[PDB]
Each structure stands twice: as structure tokens, then as C-alpha cells.
Amino acid sequence: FQENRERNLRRTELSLAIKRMLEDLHIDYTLLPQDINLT
Amino acid sequence: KSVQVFIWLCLILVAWILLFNHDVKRSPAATKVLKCITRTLISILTGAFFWLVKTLLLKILAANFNVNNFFDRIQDSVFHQYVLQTLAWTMRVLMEALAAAYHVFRNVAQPFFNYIEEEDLLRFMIKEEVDLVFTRKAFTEWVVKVYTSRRALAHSLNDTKTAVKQLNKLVTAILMVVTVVIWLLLLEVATTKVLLFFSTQLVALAFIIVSTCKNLFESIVFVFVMHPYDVGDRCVVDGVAMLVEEMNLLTTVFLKLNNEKVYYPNAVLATKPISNYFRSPNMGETVEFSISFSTPVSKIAHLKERIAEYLEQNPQHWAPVHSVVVKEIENMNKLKMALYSDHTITFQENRERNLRRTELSLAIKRMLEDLHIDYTLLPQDINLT
Amino acid sequence: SRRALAHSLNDTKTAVKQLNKLVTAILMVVTVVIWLLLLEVATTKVLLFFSTQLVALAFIIVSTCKNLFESIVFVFVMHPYDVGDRCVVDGVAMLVEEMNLLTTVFLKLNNEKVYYPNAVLATKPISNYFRSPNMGETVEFSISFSTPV
């Protein structure tokens, strides 16, 4: 961890790679369904 | 002066003792008078030696601070003398040493001449000296900054001198009292029983002043030995920026961002971290922003390139070195990034730092606006009954 | 790395020189009082008064001498870090710049010069990045509970 800049750059690259990988796999997150009744 | 007085006193003492070494019983009463006189002479010799060691200690501490103190003072004095010409002995000179300055500088410079008048500098100093010393507005700002730095250095020197004077007064007081009791004991005016009672009373007094003497002495150690900050330097204590105004043996006047006068005991500071902005090198800065998780990597690359070009095209405020990082991903809805850059100055100039940070934030906002980057909340579905 | 090692060696030499100066001072004063006592220049009563004065001085410098000596112990015996090695104190990364008998210059991620007393560090954990082996990393992400295995 001495090379803070290099570690941060590598972590950013890993995060971007993970984001791309999730994008290709078609993985989505949805909130809890909510029901509404009118009066 | 101290050594001269010491040698004079020792020479007088030895001359008297050698002359009086004769064993003549002039009178039984005269023996007591001679004994008292020689006891007083040796007592004053001891007092002179104590004064000599006191001044030696004070001078060594003063010079330990004075290496840097007089370096800065000499630099400021040389700058001030050069400016005036264009328009120990060192300690005395340093002690002796705005709109008016700007007006004077403008008058010296040729009218309608933004650049520094080379002819004026040449007539006042050599070309090499003028170049080493070195826009009319920029020159005026530099002169004002130099004058402010010289004034701050003079104020710091005055505060250090006042603290040294207080310490000298305390040391002198203690040495007077110890030599007075030494003389009283050497004259055997009182008996032993009362002497022992007084010794016990002094022991009790010490046991009473335990806490105060300990706190004061550790305060001296913190002020001198540690020397974490000087006058006129902004420091962060307990995570809040604070500016040093005046330093004492037990009180340190501080000014916050809102000109809040705070008296911080020196003993407490000895157990807490202290950060100095003035001595620190060029400081960094962080800007926090978030953008949608679905943005293409091409937009991120374009943003990074534009940030690099903006930073490199303004070297006067930010250094070329920079870094764009991603902290963490939460709900994969927004990405957390921080922009790291190094300012051309320290954090002492709070107003300038804040203005530069505001300019950087506005620039980043504009850059995001041009790139067409938007953030949307998590989609929500609703079913009716 | 060579420049950092040279700077660390210079800092260690400066600390050793300060300790040598302190030790030399104390040994000069003790030998001076030894000589004065051996010459029996003064009487016993004043000698006892001076002994009591020295006892009072020690009782006054209790805290400072204790703190300084434990600082030496922490710097030398424990030896938790050297110059040029990044360390985490109280959960914040900090880079060592220079080490003294009572002051340790530190540089944070934003080049913040912080003077940390050595005595306080003796009662807090210290982490050294330079001496540690290859370090790990963690990345946090969340995905829908209904995704197939």
C-alpha cells in the first residue's frame, strides 16, 4: 500500500472492469414492489 | 558581560583571601565579622555562578530557536533593505526592522509599463541581483507579501523574546531565593531545629505545588524542545484549523477562521497531535462528485483527458500531477470518484485556497455539463388495485 | 529507494547525536558534582541542602524525564517503523518524514505535516506498510436476489 497512486489506479481499473462485466452479464437490481390503492 | 563579572569577582575574592590569609588574632569579635564577610563573599560568588549558568541556558535555548529565527529574519531584512533601496548585532537589527508600498512601487516603475522597469533595477542594483530578486501588479503583490512576512517574523521574534524574558524572570526569582537561603544557612543565624522545621515546610510546599510545577515545566519542554509551531503559522488542533497569535509559558493565543481568540493550555497540547501548515510542502485537495453507473467508459476517458488538459493549462494554480479514482460502488446506481490535485501554495492562505477550490468546482460542473452526464434514481414500479 | 535509505540513515544519525548530547550533558554534570564532593570544598550541611534541592528538581522533572525516556524506549527498543515508510495511526494513513526523541514528523495523503508525540504512540497500535507483505483489496457490489446461480 506504499504506492498510494498505483494502488488507487489499480483499484479504479478493477472497479471499471467489474462494472463492464456486470453490464455484459445483464444483471439488474430492482427495488421492493410497492402497491397503491386509490380511494 | 557574565564572564567578565565572574572573573572580576573571583579575582577579588582570591586577592582578599590571600591578603587575609595571615593568622593574626586582632580581636575575638573581629573574627566573627571576618567570618560573616567571607561567608557573604562566597554567597555572592555562588549567586554569580548561578546567574552565569542561567544566562548560559537562556542563550543556548535562544540560539537553538535563533538558527531558524535569524535565518528568516535576515532574509526578510535583506528583502526589505533591497525594496527600500529600489524605492547580537543581527538580533538588534532584526528587532529594529500595503497601499503606500504599492503606490511607491508604481511610482518607481515607468508609467504605462506593466513589466518591471529594467532600467530602474539596473540603476539601483546589478542585473544579476535584480533577476535573482525578481507585471507591475505582480511586483506590488510580491512586495506586499514580503512586507507582511517580515512583519510576521518580527512579531514572532517579539513573542519569543517575551517568553524568554518570562522564563528568565522565573529562573532569576528561584535563584535569588535559593542563594538567599544559602546565605542564611551559611551565617548560622538560626538554630538547627528551626532549620529542620523550615526544611519540612519547604517539602510540604513542594508537595503542594507538585501539579503546577509539573505542568509548567512540561509546558516549557513542549514550547522549546518540541517546537511544533511558531507565531503566525496556521495549525490544526483536534481537526479544526487555528492560527497562532502569541505564545506564553502556559497560554497560547489562537485565532480561528472567524477570528476567535482561544486560550489553549500548553500542557494539554503536549498530549495531542499538532499540524503545521506553514512548514508543510505544497498541499493537496479532493473534490467529490458522483455520476450514473451506466455511463460508457468513453465518457469517463474524455472527462479524464479534459481534466488533465485543464490542470496542465493552468500551472500557476495546480501542478500537472493529478489522479482520478473511484472509491466504491453502492447499489450500482451512482459511482463515487474523487479528484486529487496539488495546489501551488499551502493551506495558510485560506481565502485563496477557497477561491481556487470554488473555481475548480465550477470548472468540473461545466465539464460535466458539456459531456452530457446525468444521474437517475433507481427505477420504481407501482401496481394499482 | 537509495535516497530514502540515505535520508533515513541521516535521521537516525541525528537522533543518535541528540541522545549522545543529552548523555554527555548528564555525565558532565554528574562528574562535576563528583569532583566538587571529592575536593570537600564545601561543608556537609550545604551538601545536604544541595542534595535536597536535587531531589526536588527530580520530583519536578518526573513527568518530562519519564516521557522522554519512554520515548527513547519506543524509538529504539520497539522500533515499529523507519523513515520513508507509510504507516496507519488511528486508522489514517501517515508517512514518516523525520524521527526525533520526542517529535516525529509525519506526512498525510495531502502532504500534511503533523507532529506526533512519541509518548502517545507508545499506547496506540502502529501499522507499517513497507514491512508488510503483498496486501489485499476488497470491492463491494450488490446484485438482485432473484438472479439465477
Side-chain angles (χ1 to χ4, degrees), chain B residues 52-63 88 97 99-101 109 111:
Chain B
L52 191 143
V53 67
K54 160 186 79 66
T55 182
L56 154 56
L57 174 56
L58 299 203
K59 289 286 174 183
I60 171 173
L61 295 166

Side-chain angles (χ1 to χ4, degrees), chain C residues 24 28 45 58 67 71-73 91 95 129-130 134-135:
Chain C
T24 309
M28 321 332 302
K45 186 172 189 182
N67 291 319
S71 306
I72 331 171
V73 152
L95 178 56
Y129 284 177
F130 189 56
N134 292 9
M135 301 215 88

Side-chain angles (χ1 to χ4, degrees), chain C residues 33-35 38-40 42-46 48-52 55-56 58-59 61-106:
Chain C
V33 55
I34 284 281
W35 191 48
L38 187 65
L39 268 291
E40 67 265 10
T43 188
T44 62
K45 186 172 189 182
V46 302
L48 299 156
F49 174 21
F50 274 140
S51 295
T52 52
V55 162
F59 257 26
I61 81 192
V62 184
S63 190
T64 79
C65 63
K66 180 196 70 49
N67 291 319
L68 151 64
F69 179 53
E70 65 187 287
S71 306
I72 331 171
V73 152
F74 168 84
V75 168
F76 281 100
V77 152
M78 301 215 198
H79 194 213
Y81 55 80
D82 295 344
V83 168
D85 302 333
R86 206 177 307 280
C87 300
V88 166
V89 181
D90 274 343
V92 49
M94 289 181 7
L95 178 56
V96 181
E97 182 63 15
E98 199 268 327
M99 331 180 41
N100 308 111
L101 280 293
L102 288 168
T103 60
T104 312
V105 193
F106 283 103

Side-chain angles (χ1 to χ4, degrees), chain B residues 9 41 47 161 167 176 194 209 213 216 223 253 271 280 312 317 323 348 365 367 377 379 384:
Chain B
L9 166 139
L41 201 64
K161 192 177 179 181
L167 181 45
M176 321 332 302
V194 302
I209 81 192
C213 63
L216 151 64
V223 168
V253 193
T271 80
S280 168
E312 72 92 24
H317 299 337
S323 86
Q348 189 89 5
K365 156 169 92 73
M367 298 173 95
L377 282 170
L384 307 192

